[PDB]
Design a protein around this motif. Structure first.
Motif, PDB file in Angstrom:
ATOM      1  N   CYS A  66       0.676  -1.145   0.157  1.00 16.23           N
ATOM      2  CA  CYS A  66      -0.052  -0.055   0.077  1.00 16.23           C
ATOM      3  C   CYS A  66       0.954   1.287  -0.184  1.00 16.23           C
ATOM      4  O   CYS A  66       0.423   2.276  -0.594  1.00 16.23           O
ATOM      5  CB  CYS A  66      -0.867   0.036   1.309  1.00 16.23           C
ATOM      6  SG  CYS A  66      -2.232  -1.274   1.037  1.00 16.23           S
ATOM      7  N   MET A  67       2.057   1.158   0.679  1.00 15.11           N
ATOM      8  CA  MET A  67       3.045   2.330   0.517  1.00 15.11           C
ATOM      9  C   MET A  67       3.411   2.471  -0.909  1.00 15.11           C
ATOM     10  O   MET A  67       3.628   3.716  -1.230  1.00 15.11           O
ATOM     11  CB  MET A  67       4.151   2.093   1.240  1.00 15.11           C
ATOM     12  CG  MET A  67       5.055   3.152   1.684  1.00 15.11           C
ATOM     13  SD  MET A  67       6.535   2.581   2.925  1.00 15.11           S
ATOM     14  CE  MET A  67       7.147   1.324   1.970  1.00 15.11           C
TER      15      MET A  67
ATOM     16  N   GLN B 272       0.093   4.128  -2.577  1.00 18.80           N
ATOM     17  CA  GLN B 272      -0.121   5.358  -2.422  1.00 18.80           C
ATOM     18  C   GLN B 272       0.496   6.447  -3.514  1.00 18.80           C
ATOM     19  O   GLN B 272      -0.065   7.285  -4.008  1.00 18.80           O
ATOM     20  CB  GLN B 272       0.308   5.733  -1.087  1.00 18.80           C
ATOM     21  CG  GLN B 272       0.010   7.401  -0.616  1.00 18.80           C
ATOM     22  CD  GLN B 272      -1.075   7.706  -0.425  1.00 18.80           C
ATOM     23  OE1 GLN B 272      -1.819   7.699   0.582  1.00 18.80           O
ATOM     24  NE2 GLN B 272      -1.943   8.128  -1.549  1.00 18.80           N
ATOM     25  N   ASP B 273       1.718   6.168  -3.852  1.00 20.21           N
ATOM     26  CA  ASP B 273       2.735   6.899  -4.880  1.00 20.21           C
ATOM     27  C   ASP B 273       1.968   6.723  -6.227  1.00 20.21           C
ATOM     28  O   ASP B 273       1.468   7.864  -6.902  1.00 20.21           O
ATOM     29  CB  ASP B 273       3.853   6.311  -4.894  1.00 20.21           C
ATOM     30  CG  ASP B 273       4.759   6.752  -3.916  1.00 20.21           C
ATOM     31  OD1 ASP B 273       4.347   7.728  -2.997  1.00 20.21           O
ATOM     32  OD2 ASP B 273       5.895   6.062  -3.527  1.00 20.21           O
TER      33      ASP B 273
ATOM     34  N   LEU C 195      -1.167   9.167  -6.239  1.00 19.17           N
ATOM     35  CA  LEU C 195      -0.797  10.723  -6.465  1.00 19.17           C
ATOM     36  C   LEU C 195      -0.524  10.612  -8.091  1.00 19.17           C
ATOM     37  O   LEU C 195      -0.906  11.924  -8.876  1.00 19.17           O
ATOM     38  CB  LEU C 195       0.120  10.951  -5.850  1.00 19.17           C
ATOM     39  CG  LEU C 195       0.264  10.555  -4.276  1.00 19.17           C
ATOM     40  CD1 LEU C 195       1.795  11.024  -3.450  1.00 19.17           C
ATOM     41  CD2 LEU C 195      -0.873  11.052  -3.852  1.00 19.17           C
ATOM     42  N   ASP C 196       0.303   9.810  -8.695  1.00 23.32           N
ATOM     43  CA  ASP C 196       0.404   9.857 -10.339  1.00 23.32           C
ATOM     44  C   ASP C 196      -0.768   9.974 -11.049  1.00 23.32           C
ATOM     45  O   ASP C 196      -0.912  10.406 -12.048  1.00 23.32           O
ATOM     46  CB  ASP C 196       1.492   8.843 -10.757  1.00 23.32           C
ATOM     47  CG  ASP C 196       2.957   8.922 -10.009  1.00 23.32           C
ATOM     48  OD1 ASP C 196       3.524  10.023  -9.874  1.00 23.32           O
ATOM     49  OD2 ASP C 196       3.326   7.920  -9.487  1.00 23.32           O
TER      50      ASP C 196
ATOM     51  N   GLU D 207      -3.662  10.654 -10.168  1.00 19.36           N
ATOM     52  CA  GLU D 207      -4.239  12.023 -10.011  1.00 19.36           C
ATOM     53  C   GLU D 207      -3.795  13.207 -10.881  1.00 19.36           C
ATOM     54  O   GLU D 207      -4.312  13.882 -11.525  1.00 19.36           O
ATOM     55  CB  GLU D 207      -4.369  12.235  -8.234  1.00 19.36           C
ATOM     56  CG  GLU D 207      -5.017  13.863  -8.057  1.00 19.36           C
ATOM     57  CD  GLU D 207      -5.133  14.003  -6.465  1.00 19.36           C
ATOM     58  OE1 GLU D 207      -4.297  13.266  -5.867  1.00 19.36           O
ATOM     59  OE2 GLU D 207      -5.718  14.929  -5.896  1.00 19.36           O
TER      60      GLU D 207
ATOM     61  N   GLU E 139      -5.602  -3.117   9.450  1.00 19.78           N
ATOM     62  CA  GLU E 139      -6.954  -2.479   9.156  1.00 19.78           C
ATOM     63  C   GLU E 139      -6.467  -1.202   8.352  1.00 19.78           C
ATOM     64  O   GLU E 139      -7.044  -0.584   7.655  1.00 19.78           O
ATOM     65  CB  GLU E 139      -7.175  -1.833  10.823  1.00 19.78           C
ATOM     66  CG  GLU E 139      -7.774  -3.042  11.612  1.00 19.78           C
ATOM     67  CD  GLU E 139      -6.831  -3.743  12.417  1.00 19.78           C
ATOM     68  OE1 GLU E 139      -5.597  -3.644  11.899  1.00 19.78           O
ATOM     69  OE2 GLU E 139      -7.093  -4.709  13.288  1.00 19.78           O
ATOM     70  N   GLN E 140      -5.202  -0.785   8.426  1.00 17.48           N
ATOM     71  CA  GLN E 140      -4.548   0.054   7.494  1.00 17.48           C
ATOM     72  C   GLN E 140      -5.139  -0.341   6.056  1.00 17.48           C
ATOM     73  O   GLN E 140      -5.038   0.675   5.243  1.00 17.48           O
ATOM     74  CB  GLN E 140      -3.413   0.766   7.828  1.00 17.48           C
ATOM     75  CG  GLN E 140      -3.218   1.704   9.022  1.00 17.48           C
ATOM     76  CD  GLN E 140      -1.841   1.784   9.534  1.00 17.48           C
ATOM     77  OE1 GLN E 140      -1.074   0.980   9.171  1.00 17.48           O
ATOM     78  NE2 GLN E 140      -1.319   2.900  10.068  1.00 17.48           N
TER      79      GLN E 140
ATOM     80  N   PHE F 282      -7.172   1.817   3.446  1.00 11.35           N
ATOM     81  CA  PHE F 282      -6.752   2.221   2.355  1.00 11.35           C
ATOM     82  C   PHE F 282      -7.295   1.854   0.824  1.00 11.35           C
ATOM     83  O   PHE F 282      -7.478   2.813   0.170  1.00 11.35           O
ATOM     84  CB  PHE F 282      -5.291   2.243   2.378  1.00 11.35           C
ATOM     85  CG  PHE F 282      -4.526   2.594   1.169  1.00 11.35           C
ATOM     86  CD1 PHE F 282      -4.534   4.092   0.900  1.00 11.35           C
ATOM     87  CD2 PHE F 282      -3.929   1.806   0.304  1.00 11.35           C
ATOM     88  CE1 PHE F 282      -3.809   4.507  -0.217  1.00 11.35           C
ATOM     89  CE2 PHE F 282      -3.231   2.287  -0.700  1.00 11.35           C
ATOM     90  CZ  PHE F 282      -3.099   3.566  -1.167  1.00 11.35           C
TER      91      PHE F 282
ATOM     92  N   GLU G  40      -9.663   4.868  -0.698  1.00  8.72           N
ATOM     93  CA  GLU G  40      -8.889   5.517  -1.467  1.00  8.72           C
ATOM     94  C   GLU G  40      -8.609   4.795  -2.877  1.00  8.72           C
ATOM     95  O   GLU G  40      -8.582   5.590  -3.926  1.00  8.72           O
ATOM     96  CB  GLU G  40      -7.426   5.866  -0.828  1.00  8.72           C
ATOM     97  CG  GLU G  40      -7.510   7.151   0.150  1.00  8.72           C
ATOM     98  CD  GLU G  40      -6.155   7.683   0.882  1.00  8.72           C
ATOM     99  OE1 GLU G  40      -5.714   6.896   1.669  1.00  8.72           O
ATOM    100  OE2 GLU G  40      -5.726   8.861   0.196  1.00  8.72           O
TER     101      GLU G  40
END
Lengths: 466, 420, 466, 420
Positions: free
Chosen positions: C164-165, C168-169, C172-173, C175, C438-439, C443, C447
């Motif tokens: 998931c780390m 996340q990047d 953003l790309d 978006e 849970e994260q 996520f 998201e």
């Protein structure tokens, strides 16, 4: 504590490099160029006494920055603010101060002297880094360890043999920095506003010879060997590309070396020095500063490309940022690298354990090739039989400590009898490393020792991280 | 026309540089390296027949990519794909092709040959660009014109004195490329998988002196003077920084020169050759020189993260950056030479500009002269008394610095650059 | 095979992206802009029939490049060579071809259409990379493994939590690329030679309204929502910075992800897909192409900075290199990343073994803190006693396989009796991971799923490395 | 005067940005974060007294670096050095300062506050630069002048129509910075050593909802709207790319604008304000904008090699690049505003240039007119019939695009920029 400060000037670089570009150094060098300008034209028979010169010499170090800022926030001329400030402290010399020269006579030539002195601060630190690694290279010249390609286990090398790979890069950097100091950087001399020396000719009644001599004598007193002949206003800014390119090259070297150490720390084979559980904090700091140093060169190549004709001032602000910071960043990187080299701890038992756990699988290509030539007509069967011996050998090594496990397994299996007599050498790690030991010896004697021989009277400094 | 093509390879660069990095030439170098390897091993005592070596020479220049593309599909390893492609084209020499070597023996050494030959293409073009501007500088060494600092009128100079200011940059560029070709670039040689020559030590039954001779003979057969001695798997990639740094320096030099021409063209003083109008060639030269200016920034990053003995994240980017850098420099030098050969000057337009800007330049000389005589004549407005040593500076610079620098290129200065 | 070819066009990028910038696409789009220009002015009541238009429409795909090169190597005008070539194949339309427009009308607007279509090729590939990693993230949502800081062992996380780390990047790309396609890129329209529309006004007798309508109708037929109003000659080149910056940002993401995979391959916890001993060749290739993509943006920011007034042509050559190659490099990186994600193999037994070998030492800080609060007045003694238990526990785990070794040791030593009841939870790896599980769930649901929901009808493509 | 100082921090940038990244403000943010942490934990039920929290508030703005520098010498860890420095200044709150948190709770969150506040300093200066050029554009919306393509005379335009071409760049810059401040930058919050909140889960006896509330309350107390949720140890460093990318975009915009002013100054059409002469301020603006242009290239490299949950090779370079980027952008906007406020035009010099270059521009119109009437009059040479819609384009652009963009900055447009 309320204003920001670049940690390069306050934390990471050495005091000697920080002062090498200080405002006080710039003015004292400005006043030294006026003393050399005077004692050069007084040498060519001019209305300049010996009385005005020693008064300049006696009043060189002192500088009244109060009047300098008063004239600078009034007429906005940094040079003329200091030709007037110096004139106040030298009443006899005042009419013969900055006589005939343009502003860039003191600005460019002082910058050139600072850049040269900056290289003279870095050169011993490159040689020290070479010296510390070279000592470690011959200490671990025969310390057998696993080589790593793709960050995967590969055939054995030695730790000293790997360190020479690092030293090779530093040797190229030392060579580049010595050529910058002794060849690339030339003096700017006295050239006028557009490099035609039109204004100095009026001072010498159109005598080309005294004007040429003027530029020749100023080059010796400044410590330079030659000067540019067809400049515009300033020295060719391409010199600034050569300087930052070589400094950025040092950044690439430091970043690769310290990344390698960080990688080897994850395998627990090395450990950087710390204070007397621990992370490679110094190698990580060296990588961040090296990365900043790596990329600082692109500003200069863009600057040089857009220099308009005889001059354009869009280089002034960026040169007083990028040039000192590149030297400060290079100084901090080599300080860290010398630390890491002087205190790098290696773990031979870990290297041997990581080596022993992978040797059963590294050798299966070479023995299988020999078996095929001996008659192994079932290549897949022979390979599968070897992989079973190796997989079972790796288990006996880890749990039972039987280091010579794969040897005994293949010696007891007469399927591999055609190569039984060749196994003691095939399985010898001292054989697998090839010429690693001898390559270290030739490299140190033939390339390292001649390169840093001139720095013998300055290799003793111990660099400390504070 | 359907698939996009890079304009550097499609039109801008000359075909000599384009073919210098082509695939056909690459495997010809690979095969020539295997021939030198066979000659050396036969010289060192290994059972290799002249019939096998003559077989490799005869089929060197014939490449069947249909076989190479086929065996590469199953192998995924293109060096062995061309090993067994040459073994099919050489049934006798088959068991001794690539004998004892690793993939970087042909991969890295062929690159160094292509890089060294690429410099040999660039060097005379740098010399022609130098010689062409040298002729203009002498032709206009006394052509008085207006010098500009901050792009505003400054004290007068001559057009030839300004042209030599451009030449001084190209002279520093010349000796950098020569230092690259004659000194910085060393051969990789036969170093093995991690640089320890362990495989060749085994092939020679542990004879250290044979393995040493193997590397020295191969270095000489390839036309190099020395080889690196403590590599990992490859030659030190810092050499790639050195190469692209000097090529990027060419772009910065070309960009300033062609920007100066664009600036002077807006004043109608100079004009680039053609078949007011557009300085299209000087603008393309600035455009290509800008791409060349920044191309080295990925080589410095590549070197910084080479992991230990090797990581393969250098291979794909070196296939792009290194050829494109040479192609960019080649196209810029072709344009710069053509512009230098046809650089048109307009002395009347230059003279009028210095006339309409002279009031903002004589105020200082009349100040001290009125202090001299008059308290509080026609030839003091004569700019010929204000150009300083610009005339003599062109002479000594051309005679004492330019002529020695390009003396070795005297046999190849005649080739004119034609931009169409 | 004799001429060099960029491997981005011949090897690494997809066929659809290579053709998106092809010369044939440029001309067909040029002819489409002439058809839209005609059917817009014919819409505003002009001497243009419907007969000339369909003849243009019928003769759009075909292009006579022979006459185009004949006119281009004679008068040296790429645009006018194709306004004449198109006129030959459209004899009725010839007088009303390129009527009133400048050269940049077909050059800039076609480039804008290619850049938009280029983003529409990349966007599904970013979402696919997100989708493949997200599936793996919830597959290994609870697969406990060692976290790594400074490339040293740290407290436990889960493999899904680490992925998931990476996701996340990519979010953003995605978006950034969606905002480029739907907001940043505007149409250039019809503006004239210097953006004043002076030449179109003559064609409309000085009627500002029909000229404004002309630019409005051309924007719809081109598929754009608005157009720049105060251009010079071209669309503001700052748009090219925004495009390459976002593409270079993708390079940074891909380089970090694939470096992480290469690092995790050295720990033998993961393995990338291969063909059915092995190296992370695909992640290494993705890093090299991502590095090239990372640095390609600095050419555009230098280009924009030196655009002279209304225009200067020093952007033409560099834009036809950097813009297509940036898209080709981004296309090749996302193709590789989708491969690696779809076939990434993880090894749970290796992760647990690496975890079990380091847990004895990871816990000594937390238990020592609890012991001090319980009365451990000899902190150094208590620490040394814990380190001895942990060091001896790590040996029993490796050689004897006793996984619950440190538990039994501390339970048998009543020196640590005050925390005997808390050890079963303190030593639980499922406790040490915190909210990692849970994260991942929040996520993915909050998201990831909304971000790629619009790509649901195009997430099925399997990308293959060839 | 002995130690070198960066001219960005020493003179070029204003003191608001200089102090925004100072060390004193950094530990004030660290202490304010510890206060918010104590307030939140007390709100969530932890035994923390109002007396302890009021003790931290009272001694927040008093920093004794002599103690901080001392304990940092033995610790080598500057966060704990300021933890136990605040514990000495707060004997009551000592056992609960930094309770359960990791070093990046104060390190990364204080950075995000400094970065967010730095944007709040830059934004009105972008708005002033926009508004100042907006006034010049309307003032000279009908001032006919010569447009230049390839830096050669092209068809006429107006000076205000060209000024709006500059403003269009600054408008794109404005919304980028606003998107950064209002959207892209998220809070880090309380995530722990590897982002899993394992330490705070332990502090709250495993209450998931308490740890969730801890992060939401802290995000709100700090003035942010959301926080990242799947970090490693730090907030995603791609945010640093985003920030420096937009700041580098400011430099490219300023560089072109000030280059256009330098170009027009060589034609004596425009002149930058002062106390012919030197465009010193426009040249410094180009110099600083160039350093700002390239500063982001080390952030993209930094992000690319962040190892797994974290590597520390980002810390030192972020301390240099991030503040210098804001300082560079701040100095460029200060110069650009001062130049825009005092931009002097010369309509007579502009008019004469269009006159002496008009022959190379009317040849096309007379061609079709002679084809119309005459086979093979004074106002056809009138440039007022040749500027197109340049007048109306300035009006609609200023009214429909510029005014809405800076409407929110109406309360802070009056501050003039003075360069001395």
């Amino acid at each position: 504590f309320e204003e920001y400060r670049n940690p390069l000037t306050k934390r990471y670089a050495s005091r000697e490099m920080v002062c090498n570009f200080g405002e006080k150094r710039k003015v004292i060098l400005w006043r030294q160029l006026w003393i050399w300008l005077a004692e050069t034209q007084k040498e060519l028979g001019f209305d300049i006494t010996d009385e005005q010169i020693n008064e300049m010499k006696s009043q060189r170090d002192s500088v009244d920055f109060g009047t300098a800022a008063a004239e600078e926030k009034a007429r906005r001329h940094d040079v003329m603010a200091h030709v007037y400030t110096f004139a106040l402290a030298c009443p006899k010399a005042a009419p013969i101060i900055h006589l005939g020269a343009t502003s860039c006579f003191v600005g460019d030539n002082a910058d050139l002297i600072m850049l040269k002195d900056g290289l003279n601060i870095l050169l011993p630190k490159v040689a020290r880094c070479i010296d510390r690694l070279a000592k470690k290279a011959m200490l671990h010249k025969s310390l057998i360890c696993l080589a790593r390609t793709h960050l995967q286990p590969a055939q054995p090398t030695t730790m000293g043999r790997r360190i020479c790979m690092w030293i090779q890069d530093l040797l190229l950097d030392l060579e580049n920095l010595e050529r910058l100091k002794n060849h690339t950087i030339r003096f700017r001399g006295a050239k006028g506003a557009v490099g035609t020396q039109a204004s100095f000719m009026d001072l010498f009644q159109g005598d080309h010879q005294k004007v040429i001599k003027l530029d020749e004598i100023l080059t010796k007193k400044s410590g330079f060997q030659r000067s540019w002949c067809v400049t515009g206003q300033t020295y060719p800014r391409k010199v600034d590309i050569e300087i930052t390119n070589a400094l950025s090259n040092i950044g690439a070297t430091v970043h690769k070396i310290c990344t390698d150490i960080r990688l080897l720390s994850s395998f627990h084979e090395v450990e950087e020095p710390f204070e007397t559980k621990r992370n490679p904090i110094r190698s990580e700091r060296a990588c961040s500063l090296a990365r900043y140093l790596m990329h600082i060169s692109t500003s200069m190549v863009s600057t040089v490309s857009v220099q308009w004709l005889e001059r354009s001032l869009d280089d002034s602000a960026i040169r007083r940022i990028v040039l000192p910071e590149a030297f400060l960043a290079a100084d901090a990187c080599l300080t860290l690298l010398q630390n890491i080299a002087e205190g790098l701890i290696v773990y031979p038992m870990v290297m041997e354990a990581n080596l022993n756990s992978e040797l059963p699988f590294l050798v299966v290509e070479r023995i299988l090739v020999k078996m095929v030539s001996e008659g192994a007509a079932n290549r897949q069967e022979c390979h599968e039989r070897l992989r079973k011996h190796s997989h079972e050998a790796a288990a006996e090594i880890k749990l039972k400590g039987l280091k010579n496990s794969l040897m005994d397994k293949l010696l007891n299996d007469y399927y591999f009898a055609p190569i039984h007599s060749l196994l003691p050498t095939v399985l010898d790690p001292s054989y697998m490393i090839g010429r690693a030991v001898e390559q270290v010896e030739v490299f140190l004697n033939t390339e390292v020792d001649p390169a840093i021989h001139s720095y013998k009277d300055c290799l003793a400094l111990n660099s400390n991280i504070t």
